[PDB]
């Protein structure tokens, strides 16, 4: 798995 | 102003009522200041969040979170894009019967 973390601030889809 | 907002939030914590209203009355205020570029994406991604899959434990919550969120979203000025199917689903599952009918 990638270096993911549910607590991180990963905010995808700002213009997608 | 920092002393006011902290105590306001600590007060909204204990009271579920009169805090739902704060979100209903503040979210559209935020929408007003968001530019078109931000508002478009936010409205386009809110519907997936209105569904949000397993966010259904609130189905039995008296003040369900989806109720307040969709009320606030509908109380905005430009909120055109919302699917009628999701509206009916929220109305049936959550306590959004008459609001959903009015919107539809």
């Amino acid at each position: 798995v990638p270096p993911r973390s549910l607590f991180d601030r990963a905010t995808p889809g700002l213009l997608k | 102003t920092g002393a006011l907002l902290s105590a306001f939030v600590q007060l909204c914590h204990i009271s579920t009522t009169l805090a739902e209203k704060t979100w209903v009355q503040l979210f559209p205020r935020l929408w007003k200041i968001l530019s078109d570029r931000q508002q478009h994406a936010l409205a386009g991604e809110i519907s997936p969040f209105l569904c949000s899959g397993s966010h259904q434990v609130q189905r039995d919550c008296q003040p369900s979170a989806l109720n307040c969120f969709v009320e606030a979203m509908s109380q905005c000025v430009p909120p055109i894009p919302i699917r009628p199917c999701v509206l009916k689903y929220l109305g049936k599952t959550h306590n959004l019967w008459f609001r959903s009918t009015l919107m539809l």
């Binding site: 973390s5 607590f7 601030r9 | 979100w23 936010l42 434990v57």
Partner: protein
């Protein structure tokens, strides 16, 4: 006196073991029997005669209780006073009585378990053969089927001390995360009223999230329900210390926080909660 006090070591309790505890002050000096052979003591061992009984006491307790249980408690506390290490041979036979007494539940056993967890957690030497059974017994009895809250608080304390050290790497991430998730699952379900151990576990997870972040970032994935529960807890200090770390993880921009709460945050783990007040928190703190 070395010839006489040995008689008290034979577990003639009559509430005198508390008086035998007085001899701990003497053992604080050297207690050289473990770090080297037993013959290194100079005319105060006849700690050979005492270590002999401390080792042989396992017989009655393993061959089968409160009497011998407290005897073992006190003798291991006195022997382990200064030198924390001790031979694996006695552990391999003593830790069986732990599980045997644990499964016997169907009052002093709680204190015996407290002392045993205190004494055993100082050093870990097994080659992952029996240590697996140790961690399994912990997570299945002290967390899941613990009737008393004191032993649960004590295991929370020991795992906090485990995650607290930073120098040497006695614990490992796997069993650490296993214990943490089992706690997150059961500690709040079976002990909702005893807010003390709940606050202790929440402080533990808050420390795990705050300190040593550069080292551990995968453990945070499974402990999302714990973080959310600590955020929605009824205690104001815990809520504040959780929000102060929940806010700094994102840019101080209204649009970024809105996108976060709308598409990147999963509120499923909240559980019949009015989580929108946390949205109010996040939207008003950035002002």
């Amino acid at each position: 006196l070395q010839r006489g006090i040995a008689a008290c070591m034979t577990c003639g309790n009559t509430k005198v073991l508390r008086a035998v505890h007085s001899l701990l002050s003497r053992l604080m000096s050297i207690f050289p029997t473990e770090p080297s052979t037993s013959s290194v003591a100079s005319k105060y061992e006849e700690e050979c005669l005492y270590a002999a009984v401390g080792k042989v006491i396992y017989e009655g307790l393993t061959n089968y209780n409160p009497s011998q249980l407290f005897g073992t408690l006190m003798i291991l506390k006195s022997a382990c006073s200064n030198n924390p290490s001790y031979i694996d041979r006695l552990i391999s036979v003593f830790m069986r009585s732990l599980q045997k007494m644990v499964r016997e539940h169907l009052g002093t056993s709680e204190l015996v378990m407290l002392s045993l967890e205190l004494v055993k957690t100082r050093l870990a030497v097994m080659s992952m053969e029996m240590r697996k059974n140790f961690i399994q017994a912990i997570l299945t009895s002290l967390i899941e089927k613990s009737p008393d809250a004191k032993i649960l608080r004590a295991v929370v304390k020991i795992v906090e001390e485990w995650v607290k050290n930073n120098s040497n790497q006695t614990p490992t991430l796997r069993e650490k995360s296993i214990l943490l998730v089992k706690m997150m699952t059961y500690i709040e379900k079976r002990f909702p009223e005893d807010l003390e151990l709940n606050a202790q576990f929440l402080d533990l997870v808050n420390y795990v999230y705050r300190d040593e972040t550069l080292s551990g970032s995968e453990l945070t994935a499974k402990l999302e329900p714990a973080f959310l529960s600590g955020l929605r807890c009824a205690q104001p200090l815990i809520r504040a210390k959780f929000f102060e770390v929940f806010d700094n993880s994102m840019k101080r921009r209204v649009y970024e926080r809105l996108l976060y709460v709308t598409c990147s945050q999963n509120w499923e783990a909240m559980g019949n909660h009015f989580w929108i007040k946390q949205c109010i928190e996040l939207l008003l703190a950035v002002c």
